[PDB]
């Protein structure tokens, strides 16, 4: 009973020290787990959502909401641990262009989620506000037959959840472009809206 939605309390500074209850180190210890356990939890996720949903579209939106609830957490944790706690630090750039948060994703997010850095990151020549984020080998979903793409939305559900909470609202879809020796390649394309673009249209 400290902060309700009803009032504000007034208590004096430089009073007595209160009790010590719960604390934890924010910086990561290096922890590893098998790929099989997270793959088993991932297929159990897709199995339960296959069980309790009717058609493909709202299944995809529910999986994207599942990814969203990791991404909105993950933004502040990765930026705070890339700024460096009780140790003396400061504050990163807190980047605000479009072309460097995607650089931040392709550099740090994919090398945080996985051992390897993300592969390629190109724009679209035919239209602006379309950005291609591509890998060669999806390590979330390498265990499903390749003709289904909807099970690939969870990771781009992260990316929308990484982007909308960072101040750039957008929308993502994913397709599979079988280019080269990689049969599954998994393009994720990011559709922004107009209302952000003219904002950076206003900023020269």
């Amino acid at each position: 009973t400290v902060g309700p939605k009803q009032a504000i309390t007034s208590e004096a500074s430089t009073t007595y020290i209160p009790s010590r209850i719960y604390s934890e180190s924010l910086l990561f210890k290096r922890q590893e787990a098998s790929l099989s356990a997270m793959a088993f939890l991932f297929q159990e996720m897709i199995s339960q959502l296959h069980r309790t949903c009717k058609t493909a579209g709202d299944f995809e939106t529910k999986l994207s909401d599942y990814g969203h609830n990791i991404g909105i957490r993950l933004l502040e944790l990765l930026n705070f641990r890339a700024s460096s706690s009780n140790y003396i630090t400061k504050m990163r750039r807190r980047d605000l262009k479009i072309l460097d948060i995607l650089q931040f994703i392709h550099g740090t997010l994919w090398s945080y989620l996985f051992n390897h850095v993300s592969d390629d990151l190109v724009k679209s020549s035919e239209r602006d506000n379309e950005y291609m984020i591509v890998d060669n080998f999806p390590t979330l979903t390498q265990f499903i037959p390749g003709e289904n793409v909807s099970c690939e939305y969870f990771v781009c559900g992260i990316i929308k959840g990484f982007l909308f909470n960072a101040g750039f609202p957008c929308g993502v879809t994913a397709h599979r472009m079988p280019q080269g020796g990689h049969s599954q390649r998994t393009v994720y394309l990011i559709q922004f809206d107009r209302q952000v673009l003219d904002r950076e249209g206003l900023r020269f």
């Binding site: 500074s13 430089t14 609830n69 957490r73 900023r203």
Partner: protein
């Protein structure tokens, strides 16, 4: 005395506390009930103006005193997720805040650390008030040690 707040993106507060020096056992005479929520919502406009610009009036997470208004120095801070850490400075006379940027910037840094510790709970979703007494105990010890 200082009024401290953390405000959401859809203009709602998740944390609010007011802490005073013990000489004035009652703090902020008559401003506390009416003036201090309204001038904070007024300062949210200009913090929303300066969040998207590049070169201020470096590093964009901290920023100085954003306005001065009825002799009150209003100091802001912008987190990575868009949360805004506006905290005002009152006194009977005028107040100097820029000399405490050696200390108050660090105060905003570990209360940002405390907010990241709050956010990592999977049960705690955003647009929820931070209804935890442990958070109060840490932020008033940080208010004591960063006076």
């Amino acid at each position: 005395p200082q009024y401290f707040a953390i405000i959401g993106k859809k203009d709602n507060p998740v944390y609010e506390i007011e802490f005073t020096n013990a000489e004035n056992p009652q703090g902020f005479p008559q401003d506390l009930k009416e003036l201090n929520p309204f001038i904070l919502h007024a300062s949210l406009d200009i913090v929303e103006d300066l969040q998207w610009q590049i070169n201020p009036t470096t590093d964009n997470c901290y920023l100085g005193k954003v306005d001065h208004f009825y002799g009150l120095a209003i100091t802001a801070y912008i987190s990575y997720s868009g949360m805004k850490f506006v905290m005002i400075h009152g006194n009977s006379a005028n107040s100097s805040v820029v000399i405490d940027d050696n200390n108050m910037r660090s105060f905003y840094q570990e209360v940002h650390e405390l907010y990241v510790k709050t956010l990592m709970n999977p049960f705690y979703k955003i647009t929820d008030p931070i209804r935890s007494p442990a958070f109060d105990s840490r932020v008033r010890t940080l208010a004591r040690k960063h006076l």
